Amino acid sequence: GSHMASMKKKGSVVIVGRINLSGDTAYAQQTRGEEGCQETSQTGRDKNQVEGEVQIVSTATQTFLATSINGVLWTVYHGAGTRTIASPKGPVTQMYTNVDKDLVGWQAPQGSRSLTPCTCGSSDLYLVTRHADVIPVRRRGDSRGSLLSPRPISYLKGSSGGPLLCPAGHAVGIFRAAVSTRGVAKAVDFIPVESLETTMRS
Ligand SMILES: *[C@](O)(C(=O)NC1CC1)[C@H](CCC)NC(=O)[C@@H]1[C@H]2CCC[C@H]2CN1C(=O)[C@@H](NC(=O)[C@@H](NC(=O)c1cnccn1)C1CCCCC1)C(C)(C)C
Ligand SMILES: [Zn+2]
């Protein structure tokens, strides 16, 4: 048995900022501080204005990214689990949940902008990090790419859920993991956008 009246619920994912890609300069903006984030995770009620394609999101313990593509805000299952997302009307249930693809999605928040899936086939990609770095990545397979300049894995911590973009700024994938050797990220693993598209098709 167990005492049911004291069973807690997991909080909602909370949008706490965005990676601004609108101008000629990429930069992170914070829209909610830590105390606000904790409260909003509990209530699931977030009245803040949302803008942009890449959101900075937080659970109780971690901060990472979520990316809007085709009207859905996507992130990684290993980060978000089955959590609701906070919104002006209260918690919003996931529209997509797929542990096998490591993928979740919610209806894109009002005010957000969506990326469109890449159709050009380019293997020259750009990873947008949680600190608003735009890192060149050569595509190496369906779900892998190599960093042109390897980095300590710390550099990529917090970027799970962010986008890989083609040269024209279309979505190629969702970053999920670094391939590391002795703490150095030489490559990345991502969820291909075609996998999101199939998820949306049925
Ligand atoms: C992302 O969730 C994030 O930003 N998290 C911060 C806390 C909010 C995070 C980005 C890390 C740079 N992703 C991960 O932590 C992923 C997820 C995916 C499911 C489990 C975890 C582990 N992970 C990783 O990126 C790891 N990488 C790996 O496990 C790779 N393996 C190795 O690097 C390796 C394996 N054997 C020997 C030597 N090295 C595998 C490789 C195959 C594809 C999947 C990733 C770490 C070690 C955390 C970088
Ligand atoms: Zn493209």
Residue numbers in the entry: 980 to 1181
Please give the exact wording used by the authors of the publication that reports this structure.
The HCV NS3/4A protease – a chymotrypsin-like serine protease – is a prime therapeutic target that cleaves four known sites along the virally encoded polyprotein. The NS3/4A protease also hydrolyzes two human proteins, TRIF and MAVS, which are part of the innate immune system, thereby confounding the innate immune response to viral infection. These complexes include wild-type protease and resistant variants R155K, D168A and A156T each bound to telaprevir, danoprevir, vaniprevir and MK-5172, with resolutions ranging from 1.10–2.50 Å; S139A protease variants were used except for telaprevir, which requires covalent bond formation with the serine 139 for efficient binding.
Against wild-type protease, macrocyclic inhibitors danoprevir, vaniprevir and MK-5172 exhibited antiviral potencies in the sub nM range (IC50 = 0.24, 0.34 and 0.11 nM, respectively), while telaprevir potency was significantly lower (IC50 = 1030 nM), consistent with previous reports. In the telaprevir complex, the catalytic serine (S139) was covalently bound to the C-α carbon of the ketoamide warhead. The relatively weak binding affinity of telaprevir to wild-type protease results in a potentially narrow range by which resistant mutations can be tolerated.
